[PDB]
Design a protein around this ligand. Structure first.
Ligand SMILES: CCCCCCCCCCCCCCCCCC(=O)O[C@H](COC(=O)CCCCCCCCCCCCCCC)COP(=O)(O)OCC[N+](C)(C)C
Ligand SMILES: [Ca+2]
Ligand SMILES: [Ca+2]
Ligand SMILES: [Mg+2]
Lengths: 168, 450, 129
């Protein structure tokens, strides 16, 4: 009943002239390790961009060690993107962009796409002027995101359709 | 409540707040429109025996005196066995039970101490039709585009063929009451799967002016076919079972449909389309609106979408259990005001299993058509426009009652007086309240033959 | 990661693999009526002139002289000036001797040695007629 103290929580500390992004969705050891390797590569020109991860379930021991090795550039927070309180903690309004990862190996592509679409609505509800990049499983779900009044492709909003690119 | 909102937008919010027991403290300084809205939320139904001083006077003079003197709104009385809503030319008899709207039961006691010192059905309350077939009511994309649909009602239904039945009568029949003439009846079009509506067509055979369009209301092609930009009210109803995977994902279907319509452009934009949305979870109301602050712990009736008559949920109906026990007549007034006057043995007719059966109209039967109905008016034009500029609410209440017999219940004005066409509900403003030319008044309209 | 650092990078990918997907095509498709046709005009027919992804062979043709011993840089220069083709890479047999398996070489150096059985990834222009 006493248990242990909340390992991950609180509000991200603000810094002057600091650029950060929010990554949500499928936060597992496969996605985080692969994303961090490509995001932080020596070939790409180095830019001071902070990476903030938001997820509901606490990370396992393997993911915690990965975050430790990237202590000065990667942070993790416990919470859901559907909660406006949790959105304030990670400071989405000050984030350069929000990245929504998707579970490619999912039993129901419709269920995965519907959950990811709801995440964009929650982010756009908090503030419309946020760049959102989302991975999409099926092409017919792209119409729902385009019909959102706050969705603007000219402002940087992008949809990465796995089915469209794979078959292309 | 959704059907009543079609006739008068924002009526569902006024109905829900009038049965939830809320204690209202006046505040020194806060947001102006919230302060007016919160004062209305402190109003609820109350019943009290009328004073003997009121004996022998008509109802119109009785309710006018209560508003001017006792600052109480009398809207219904009981004549004995039956309840009449704003009766015309009805005397106040001895020991009469009256229905009042007030902040608390203490204020209501002043009324007791006042002193000088085949066209219609068998019941004749709803219109009837000779059991039109479902196949004749099915329309295609080109069939619905070529026909004119102005001032109609669009019912966005999300239901699987195996989904539990939600009783699509309860939304259509109140719109088919005998209070409305056949020329002023609002056309009803249902957008959804025909397989689900087929099971619902048993009790919709005899209701005139019903249209069924196959497809999904999410698609923009179906919405443009039925001309959603010209409809009086767009209703979003979901009948699918909740998967219980996540509370925030329960209303993903209705939220997407509401946002899709708000963004469409017509050759008039979709943001001005009046819509009402059904929510299975209270916490999903935060995604219905964009220009507002959201809080998980806030109460549903405190939210902006609910205050504007846009969002609705069954959680606000739990207060009816306590209200019914303390007074059986309170629930009877509820049903007669929202169901279009559903007489008792009419449910006995419905319980038989043969559906709605019609009857031949007689002089005795046609007398039931004369009763008050829920309506909304505007002060921009007409003979009541003089009070819009600077006239007080009390002056409008007396003038409307004396001239046309209409009983003003509340007001429906824009949230911002200056940008956005959002209107919130004020229930029973004080007699000294100031009006605006862009105000809409909830009134109880008498039946005018012809 | 590529999309976040540059939005134009994703736009190039979509145009290169989908044959050209203009933004308002997505809006038309999102309506729900499917693909919609239109009457070709003088301006509408101008969109047909754009580069396409194709593959050529150095076995028999006007560019066959570089197959024997010509360098990759010479083939890239000659093809661009004469035909407008832009060489992207090579599609060469795994074994030079045997299986008919060809692997992909992306942007070989200008000093690379070509083979008569080599295929080149090129971007050919639209030729009317
Ligand atoms: C009192 C509250 C103690 C809470 C400890 C909870 C705990 O178990 O964590 C304990 C943590 O225990 C510790 O970290 C001990 C830290 C050292 C405590 C003593 C340090 C100070 C010494 C005294 C100083 C004053 C000296 C006075 C004399 C001069 C280990 O279990 P776990 O979390 O790794 O495993 C989790 C699995 N369950 C939950 C099932 C156990
Ligand atoms: Ca009260
Ligand atoms: Ca909101
Ligand atoms: Mg109230």
């Amino acid at each position: 009943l006493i248990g242990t103290r909340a390992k991950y929580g609180g509000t991200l500390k603000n810094e002057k002239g600091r650029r950060h992004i929010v990554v949500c969705g499928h936060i597992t050891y496969e996605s985080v390790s692969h994303f961090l390797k490509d995001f932080l590569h020596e070939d790409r020109e180095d830019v001071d961009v902070e990476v903030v991860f938001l997820h509901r379930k606490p990370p396992d021991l393997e993911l915690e060690g990965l975050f430790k090795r990237h202590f000065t550039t990667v942070e993790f927070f416990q919470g859901t993107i559907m909660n406006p309180i949790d959105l304030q903690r990670v400071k989405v309004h000050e984030a350069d962009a929000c990245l929504v990862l998707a579970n490619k190996y999912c039993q129901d592509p419709d269920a995965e796409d519907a959950a990811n679409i709801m995440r964009v609505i929650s982010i756009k509800n908090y503030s419309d002027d946020i760049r959102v990049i989302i991975q999409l499983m099926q092409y017919h779900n792209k119409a729902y995101l385009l019909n959102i009044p706050s969705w603007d492709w000219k402002q940087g909003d992008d949809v990465i359709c796995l089915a469209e690119l794979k078959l292309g | 409540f959704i059907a009543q909102s079609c006739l008068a937008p924002g009526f569902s919010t006024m109905m829900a707040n009038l049965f939830a027991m809320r204690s209202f403290k006046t505040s020194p300084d806060m947001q102006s429109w919230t302060n007016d809205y919160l004062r209305g939320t402190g109003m609820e139904m109350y019943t009290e025996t009328l004073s003997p001083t009121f004996i022998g006077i008509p109802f119109a003079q009785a309710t006018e005196l209560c508003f001017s003197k006792l600052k109480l709104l009398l809207l219904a009385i009981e004549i004995k066995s039956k309840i009449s809503i704003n009766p015309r030319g009805a005397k106040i008899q001895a020991n009469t039970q009256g229905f009042f709207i007030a902040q608390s039961a203490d204020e209501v006691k002043r009324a007791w101490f006042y002193c000088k010192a085949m066209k219609y059905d068998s019941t004749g309350m709803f219109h009837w039709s000779p059991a039109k077939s479902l196949e004749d009511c099915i329309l295609d994309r080109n069939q619905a585009a070529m026909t004119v649909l102005n001032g109609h009602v669009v019912v966005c239904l999300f239901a699987d063929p195996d989904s539990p039945l939600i009783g699509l009568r309860n939304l259509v029949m109140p719109l088919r009451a005998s209070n409305f003439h056949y020329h002023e009846l609002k056309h009803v079009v249902i957008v959804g799967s025909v397989d689900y509506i087929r099971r619902e067509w048993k009790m919709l055979q005899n209701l005139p002016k019903i249209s069924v369009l196959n497809g999904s209301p999410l698609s923009r092609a179906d919405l443009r076919a039925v001309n959603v930009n010209l409809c009086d009210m767009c209703c979003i109803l979901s009948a699918k079972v909740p998967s219980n995977d996540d509370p925030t994902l329960a209303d993903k279907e209705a939220i997407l449909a509401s946002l899709n319509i708000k963004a469409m452009t017509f050759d008039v934009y979709g943001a001005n389309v009046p819509m009402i949305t059904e929510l299975v979870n209270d916490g999903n109301v935060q995604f219905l609106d964009q220009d507002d602050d959201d809080d998980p712990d806030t109460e549903l009736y405190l939210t902006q979408p609910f205050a504007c008559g846009t969002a609705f949920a069954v959680s606000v109906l739990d207060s009816l259990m306590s209200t019914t026990y303390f007074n059986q007549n309170a629930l009877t007034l509820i049903r007669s005001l929202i169901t279009g006057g559903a007489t008792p043995e009419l449910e006995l007719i419905l319980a038989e299993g043969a559906g709605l059966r019609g009857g031949y109209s007689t002089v005795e039967s046609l007398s039931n058509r004369d009763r008050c109905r829920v309506g909304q008016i505007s002060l921009y034009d007409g003979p009541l426009a003089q009070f819009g500029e600077c006239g007080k609410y009390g002056d409008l209440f007396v003038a409307a009652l004396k001239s046309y017999g209409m009983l003003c219940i509340g007001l429906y004005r824009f949230r911002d007086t200056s940008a956005s066409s959002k209107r919130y509900v004020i229930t029973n403003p004080p007699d000294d309240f100031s009006l605006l030319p862009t105000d809409q008044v909830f009134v109880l309209m008498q039946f005018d033959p012809g």
